[PDB]
Amino acid sequence: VPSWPQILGRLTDNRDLARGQAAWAMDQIMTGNARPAQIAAFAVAMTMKAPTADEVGELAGVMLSHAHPLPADTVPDDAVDVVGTGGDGVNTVNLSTMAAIVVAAAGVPVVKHGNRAASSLSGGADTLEALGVRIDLGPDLVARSLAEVGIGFCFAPRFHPSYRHAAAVRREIGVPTVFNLLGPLTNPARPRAGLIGCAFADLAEVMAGVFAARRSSVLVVHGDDGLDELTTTTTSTIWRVAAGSVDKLTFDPAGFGFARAQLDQLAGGDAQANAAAVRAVLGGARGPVRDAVVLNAAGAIVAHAGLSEWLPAWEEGLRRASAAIDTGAAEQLLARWVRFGRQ
Amino acid sequence: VPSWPQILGRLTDNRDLARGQAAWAMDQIMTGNARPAQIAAFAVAMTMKAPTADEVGELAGVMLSHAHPLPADTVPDDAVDVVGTGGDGVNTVNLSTMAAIVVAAAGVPVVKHGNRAASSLSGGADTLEALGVRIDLGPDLVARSLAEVGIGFCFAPRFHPSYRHAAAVRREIGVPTVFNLLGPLTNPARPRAGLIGCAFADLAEVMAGVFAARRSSVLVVHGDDGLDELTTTTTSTIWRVAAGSVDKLTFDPAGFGFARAQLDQLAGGDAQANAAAVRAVLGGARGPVRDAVVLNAAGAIVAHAGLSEWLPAWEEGLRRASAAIDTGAAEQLLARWVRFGRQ
Numbered sequence: 001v002p003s004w005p006q007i008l009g010r011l012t013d014n015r016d017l018a019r020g021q022a023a024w025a026m027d028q029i030m031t032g033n034a035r036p037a038q039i040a041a042f043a044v045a046m047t048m049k050a051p052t053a054d055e056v057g058e059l060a061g062v063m064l065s066h067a068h069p070l071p072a073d074t075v076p077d078d079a080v081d082v083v084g085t086g087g088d089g090v091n092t093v094n095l096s097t098m099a100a101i102v103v104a105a106a107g108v109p110v111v112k113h114g115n116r117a118a119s120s121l122s123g124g125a126d127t128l129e130a131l132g133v134r135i136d137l138g139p140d141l142v143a144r145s146l147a148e149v150g151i152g153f154c155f156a157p158r159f160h161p162s163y164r165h166a167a168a169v170r171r172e173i174g175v176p177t178v179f180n181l182l183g184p185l186t187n188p189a190r191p192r193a194g195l196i197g198c199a200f201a202d203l204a205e206v207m208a209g210v211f212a213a214r215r216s217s218v219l220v221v222h223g224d225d226g227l228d229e230l231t232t233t234t235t236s237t238i239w240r241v242a243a244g245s246v247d248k249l250t251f252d253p254a255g256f257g258f259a260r261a262q263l264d265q266l267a268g269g270d271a272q273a274n275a276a277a278v279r280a281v282l283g284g285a286r287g288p289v290r291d292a293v294v295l296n297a298a299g300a301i302v303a304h305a306g307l308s309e310w311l312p313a314w315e316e317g318l319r320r321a322s323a324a325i326d327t328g329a330a331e332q333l334l335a336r337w338v339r340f341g342r343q
Numbered sequence: 344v345p346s347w348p349q350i351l352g353r354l355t356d357n358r359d360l361a362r363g364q365a366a367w368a369m370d371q372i373m374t375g376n377a378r379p380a381q382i383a384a385f386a387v388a389m390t391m392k393a394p395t396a397d398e399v400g401e402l403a404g405v406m407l408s409h410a411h412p413l414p415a416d417t418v419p420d421d422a423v424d425v426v427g428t429g430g431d432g433v434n435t436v437n438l439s440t441m442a443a444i445v446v447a448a449a450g451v452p453v454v455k456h457g458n459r460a461a462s463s464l465s466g467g468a469d470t471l472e473a474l475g476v477r478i479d480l481g482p483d484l485v486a487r488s489l490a491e492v493g494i495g496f497c498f499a500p501r502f503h504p505s506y507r508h509a510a511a512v513r514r515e516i517g518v519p520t521v522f523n524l525l526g527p528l529t530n531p532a533r534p535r536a537g538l539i540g541c542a543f544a545d546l547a548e549v550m551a552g553v554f555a556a557r558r559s560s561v562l563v564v565h566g567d568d569g570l571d572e573l574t575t576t577t578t579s580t581i582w583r584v585a586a587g588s589v590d591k592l593t594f595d596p597a598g599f600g601f602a603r604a605q606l607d608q609l610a611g612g613d614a615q616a617n618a619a620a621v622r623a624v625l626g627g628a629r630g631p632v633r634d635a636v637v638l639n640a641a642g643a644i645v646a647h648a649g650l651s652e653w654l655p656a657w658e659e660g661l662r663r664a665s666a667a668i669d670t671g672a673a674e675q676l677l678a679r680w681v682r683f684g685r686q
């Protein structure tokens with residue numbers, strides 16, 4: 001029968017787990033039945049062994065089976081997510097959050113999964129909070145937000161309450177683990193498309209495999225400068241998930257007229273500074289930050305288009321993203337979003 | 344700037360640690376300044392990375408620098424240990440403990456370090472306890488025992504109190520780690536010689552390296568049937584440590600007239616069953632068990648000699664081991680040992 005000595009021993013022997021074992025482990029963790037030492041041992045052993053898409057899939061499956069769902073028929077079939085693993089260690093502005101606003105304003109339904117910072121000065125949730133957006137809304141109100149505003153935000157702690165023991169262990173040991181991949185893979189609203197950032201190059205393919213298994217239309221992105229976003233300072237590696245198959249690509253914004261930026265141009269600060277950066281971009285300020293936002297917003301729209309060619313999709317995505325900002329639609333959407341939570 | 348995120352991150356990246364890093368980690372663990380999750384993360388990461396002699400040497404050094412020592416000039420310079428990692432999986436009789444008694448009766452000072460059972464029905468300390476030997480004595484009384492009886496037992500919890508945090512995590516995760524190597528390396532009396540058993544064929548060389556750095560005269564043994572003992576069922580692998588240099592050897596008991604035995608002939612049971620097996624051997628009962636104890640006892644005597652050839656040393660060791668039993672000296676020694684703890 002399943003046991004920690006069994007599973008841990010199999011991982012330390014550098015062996016892939018048998019079908020169901022990873023699931024049993026996570027369920028133990030997700031039911032308060034695991035000791036912190038056992039949680040930590042499993043997270044580390046899984047990571048150092050080299051996790052497969054199947055194993056990480058079981059982990060995410062367990063989390064989603066325990067998570068608060070959104071009500072029936074409240075999430076549009078073509079909804080998209082824009083979120084990353086975090087942990088690239090580079091203090092940038094909140095590109096995923098900013099891109100998500102622009103995408104929603106372009107008419108693409110967004111149900112964003114997210115969380116506070118772990119190792120950065122301000123995460124997506126922190127910055128949205130600084131903007132006046134309600135981040136801790138429950139299933140019913142997230143559903144209403146999505147319908148009325150075009151965007152909703154799922155706070156991971158809110159929808160994954162029984163993950164709190166695992167989250168505590170992540171904080172204690174500090175080092176990244178397979179757990180760091182689970183946030184982007186466990187959106188409780190379960191959108192079928194997304195632009196998903198991965199800070200860990202060696203694990204981006206595995207995340208893509210989980211999505212492929214769900215037959216999602218996802219672009220798993222890793223900036224070759226290390227960002228868990230589509231970068232503008234150099235090329236980005238993209239694992240394109242479509243038709244249940246993964247396809248590795250290198251992406252160069254220069255092929256779309258974007259100038260090479262320096263990483264310090266994308267730098268941000270605390271929640272207030274990063275919130276000011278959002279208002280700046282949505283306000284029509286041109287520059288490095290805008291470029292990075294438009295590029296990422298377009299990538300999400302390409303992932304959305306993939307639910308049903310590469311070059312024309314990016315061109316339309318870039319057109320719609322730039323237009324969403326220039327018309328003021330993106331700025332208006334945030335205001336309407338802020339107003340929603342207050343009412 | 345030593346930290347857990349730093350050291351754990353280095354290990355998870357499959358990199359050897361820098362000088363002092365393993366020592367810092369163990370000292371944190373040995374001072375109650377490490378979370379269970381951190382301890383477990385460290386133990387697993389060290390194992391899967393594959394620990395080096397330097398690193399293991401640092402961990403043991405920390406333990407010995409926090410351990411209760413024996414009083415000044417109470418341990419002979421040529422005292423030996425007979426002890427193993429355990430965890431060979433096979434529930435056998437207490438071979439090391441039996442050899443230790445015989446070795447002591449042969450005139451070689453023995454200061455035994457040991458513990459109760461982890462995954463066995465009965466460990467060395469359990470069996471000794473069932474024989475009426477007092478195991479939980481302090482440094483003063485172990486010194487007296489070593490002087491008056493010719494043998495002493497160091498109970499690890501008694502001498503390594505600050506190890507309890509590491510011990511708890513080991514029992515929680517269950518899986519073997521680098522911690523399973525430390526027992527034989529952390530005898531508080533610090534004997535310079537011994538017959539050391541390693542159940543892990545791929546870590547025995549590491550252990551030998553640690554002893555070699557100490558300029559210790561030891562034989563690190565791995566029974567090719569999996570035992571952390573010199574076996575009689577088949578050949579054994581011996582990492583012979585002398586003059587700070589390790590030599591790897593294949594050892595054949597048949598080269599000394601030992602019949603091949605079956606592993607179930609060496610099988611044991613609870614403390615009461617194993618205690619009776621000790622009395623049987625020391626009583627002069629011929630058989631597989633006697634052959635195993637004489638062989639191991641001889642190995643410790645050979646290691647003792649190494650403090651100052653190979654076959655002639657083994658031949659002499661076998662003679663002294665056999666005679667120590669046949670003269671009743673080993674049976675008497677145990678009797679006097681039991682008597683000492685009560686007087």
Ligand SMILES: O=P(O)(O)OC[C@H]1O[C@H](OP(=O)(O)OP(=O)(O)O)[C@H](O)[C@@H]1O
Nearest residue numbers: 084086087094096097118119120123124
């Ligand atoms: O502190 P870190 O570990 O480095 O992670 C920074 C943020 O990135 C993730 O979400 P998201 O992609 O939505 O944030 P973003 O808008 O800044 O890109 C994560 O949930 C954090 O909120």
Ligand SMILES: O=P(O)(O)OC[C@H]1O[C@H](OP(=O)(O)OP(=O)(O)O)[C@H](O)[C@@H]1O
Nearest residue numbers: 426427429437439440461462463466467
């Ligand atoms: O429970 P295990 O993990 O399987 O280990 C069995 C015993 O072996 C070790 O002692 P030692 O080798 O010194 O004595 P022994 O071989 O006679 O039992 C260890 O301290 C245990 O007491």
Ligand SMILES: [Mg+2]
Nearest residue numbers: 083084096197
């Ligand atoms: Mg992001």
Ligand SMILES: [Mg+2]
Nearest residue numbers: 426427439540
């Ligand atoms: Mg032993």
